[PDB]
């Protein structure tokens, strides 16, 4: 029972290490699991003369995270061959909030490209430059209106019951 899980984890660790090795500018791999909150630790030795970018480490991180049940990317750590803890997901502070800059940059780049593509035919291919600053609303925002039509006028009222007693003594 216990040794079964031990063998399975130890074999899949070597399996994912072999897969990670076949990733181009990487020389050797070593994946380790924590299986009872799950976590993973990978020690990747990149090939001399290359360095993965910040959006490139997320590749291997979520490769080993989604190869394992119940493991979010955040518990996966990676260490280079000389220090360089390339995974700052332990903080997990601005990971959601640094994609906002990417989205805003995409928006302003699209508007800038549209301005250049509409204005170049008139003034020339390189006789125009535009820079766009887009402020964005990232605040979650709900609203529940509830409007009632006024029925003060007797000609637009809708009655369900009416008890009208009139007395008069002279």
């Amino acid at each position: 029972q216990f040794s079964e899980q031990v063998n399975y984890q130890r074999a899949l660790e070597g399996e994912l290490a072999r897969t990670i090795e076949t990733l181009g500018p990487v020389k050797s791999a070593r994946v380790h699991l924590a299986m009872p909150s799950p976590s993973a630790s990978v020690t990747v030795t990149l090939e001399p003369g290359r360095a993965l970018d910040e959006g490139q480490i997320s590749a291997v991180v979520h490769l080993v995270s989604s190869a394992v049940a119940g493991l979010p990317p955040g518990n996966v750590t990676l260490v280079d061959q000389s220090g360089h803890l390339l995974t700052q997901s332990n903080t997990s502070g601005r990971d959601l909030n640094d994609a906002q800059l990417k989205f805003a940059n995409d928006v302003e780049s699209r508007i800038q490209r549209r301005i250049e593509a509409i204005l170049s035919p008139i003034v020339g291919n390189g006789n125009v430059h535009a820079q766009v600053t887009a402020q964005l609303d990232f605040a979650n925002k709900e609203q529940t209106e509830e409007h009632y039509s006024p029925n003060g006028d007797a000609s637009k009222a809708t009655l369900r019951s009416r008890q009208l007693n009139i007395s008069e003594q002279v």
Partner: protein, 81 residues
């Protein structure tokens, strides 16, 4: 005399429930520079006022300019390097 009256009403009701999108463009500020030329061989000379007015309008329409958002647009004419 007496006049008692009890009335029960049925009222029109509208329940509009909105969940706003995350990432809308609150405000745009666009700066555009246009190069001098206006001549095949002579000295560069500022583009005419009507022309600059039409580039201003074209970039206003391409931006999606809206006074409600408080968008700002500034186009200037100056020689390049």
């Amino acid at each position: 005399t007496q006049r008692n009256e009890t009335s029960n009403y049925e009222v029109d009701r509208t329940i509009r429930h909105t969940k706003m999108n995350v990432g809308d463009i609150e405000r745009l500020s666009v700066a555009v520079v246009v190069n001098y030329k206006t001549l095949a061989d002579g000295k560069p000379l500022p583009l005419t006022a009507d022309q600059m007015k039409q580039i201003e309008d074209l970039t206003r329409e391409a931006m999606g300019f809206s006074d409600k958002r408080g968008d700002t647009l500034n186009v200037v004419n100056s020689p390049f390097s």
